[PDB]
Structure formats: structure tokens, C-alpha cells
Design a protein around this ligand. Structure first.
Ligand code: NA
Length: 197
């Protein structure tokens, strides 16, 4: 159908703490670690958002969340990361920007721009099929039905112990959220919007 702001105007359609999450000059950011969620559940949608990184940014967009309190194992996370910072060495493919965190790498990295440059990401969530388009590049295409294991990924890498639920049996409807600030690297969001497929 048509695009609408994911959180409405003035975050009216979001569940959040206003001491954590706020809009400044049209740009959403967080000063503490707690997440921001939609008040409503979504399936069969495309989500657009702009984001800007800091050096070493590690964040993510959460979709299909069936529990906003115990969200980590009951959701899918599209990784947002500063691929130009190499802190943990080479890193894992599922830690790169536009990956499905813990589950599936992006096909190329350093599609994300350098810290302080604006990025654009579109996430198409069509039941078990998730596509990530980053800066106009199709970087990630997951079919969740392949994830029959909660411990091992189709690419052979181990799934972090804190993500035990097989993605093949995960529901493909739930809340959408953004993650808060966990350390010194900031992240900024804008033009966060959604429409149905
Ligand atoms: Na992340």
C-alpha cells in the first residue's frame, strides 16, 4: 500500500522510555541501552530506514519479535555495523552490516559507508523470506526454512548460544524494534517507514 512512519509522529506509535529514546532535528537516537518497539505487530512488509554510524557501531533492526521483554531469542536481527572498524580481527560474516546476526553473512562487506555518512537500508519481510538491501545493493537473502538447527548455520558457522531457537520454526509476525546504546559508539536513525508488500 503506502508508506507510513514506523513510529508515527513524535514516537506516538512506539513503546519506549523517553529518557532513552528521542528525536533531535528529525533524527532518532538513544542515550541508554533499552530498545524501542512498535506498539503493533507486522508481517509481510518492507521497512525502510536511513542510518549513520560512528566508528565501531554495532546495532541492529529487530523484526518478528514475539516478546519485547525476552526479545533476544524470540526475534530476527538484521545487523547494523561499522564494517570499516576491524576490532575483533577479521570478524564473522554474520557480524557485518546487513547480515542476519548470528545466522547469515552479507554477500559483500563494506557496502556500509564510513562513519558519519548516511546510509539507506530496505528490509523486505515476506514470511520466511527476508531480503536486505543496503545502499542500493542486495546484500542478504534468507529463507528461514533452511535454519532447521538452532546451533549450526547452513554456512557451517555455530549460532551463538543465546540464540537457540531454530529460525525454521520462528513465527514470521511480531513487533519491530531498534536497539539502544550499549557503549561509546553512537548510531543515528531517520526516515524510518514501513508499508505492506
Ligand atoms: Na547487532
Amino acid at each position: 500500500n503506502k508508506w507510513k512512519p514506523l513510529f508515527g509522529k513524535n514516537l506516538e506509535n512506539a513503546n519506549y522510555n523517553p529518557e532513552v529514546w528521542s528525536e533531535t532535528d528529525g533524527v532518532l537516537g538513544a542515550v541508554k541501552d533499552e530498545s524501542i518497539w512498535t506498539k503493533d505487530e507486522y508481517e509481510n512488509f518492507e521497512l525502510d530506514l536511513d542510518f549513520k554510524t560512528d566508528v565501531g557501531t554495532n546495532s541492529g533492526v529487530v523484526v518478528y519479535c514475539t516478546d519485547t521483554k525476552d526479545w533476544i531469542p524470540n526475534s530476527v536481527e538484521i545487523q547494523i555495523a561499522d564494517d570499516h572498524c576491524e576490532k575483533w580481527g577479521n570478524g564473522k560474516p554474520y557480524e557485518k552490516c546487513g547480515a542476519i546476526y548470528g545466522h547469515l553473512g552479507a554477500v559483500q562487506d563494506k557496502v556500509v559507508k564510513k562513519p558519519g555518512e548516511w546510509n539507506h537500508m530496505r528490509i523486505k519481510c515476506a514470511g520466511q523470506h527476508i531480503m536486505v538491501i543496503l545502499n542500493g545493493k542486495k546484500v542478504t537473502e534468507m529463507d528461514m526454512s533452511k535454519w532447521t538447527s538452532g546451533t549450526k548455520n547452513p554456512d557451517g558457522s555455530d549460532i551463538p548460544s543465546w540464540l537457540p531457537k531454530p529460525f525454521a520454526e520462528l513465527p514470521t509476525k511480531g513487533f519491530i524494534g531498534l536497539q539502544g546504546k550499549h557503549g561509546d559508539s553512537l548510531i543515528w536513525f531517520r526516515n524510518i517507514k514501513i508499508r505492506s508488500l
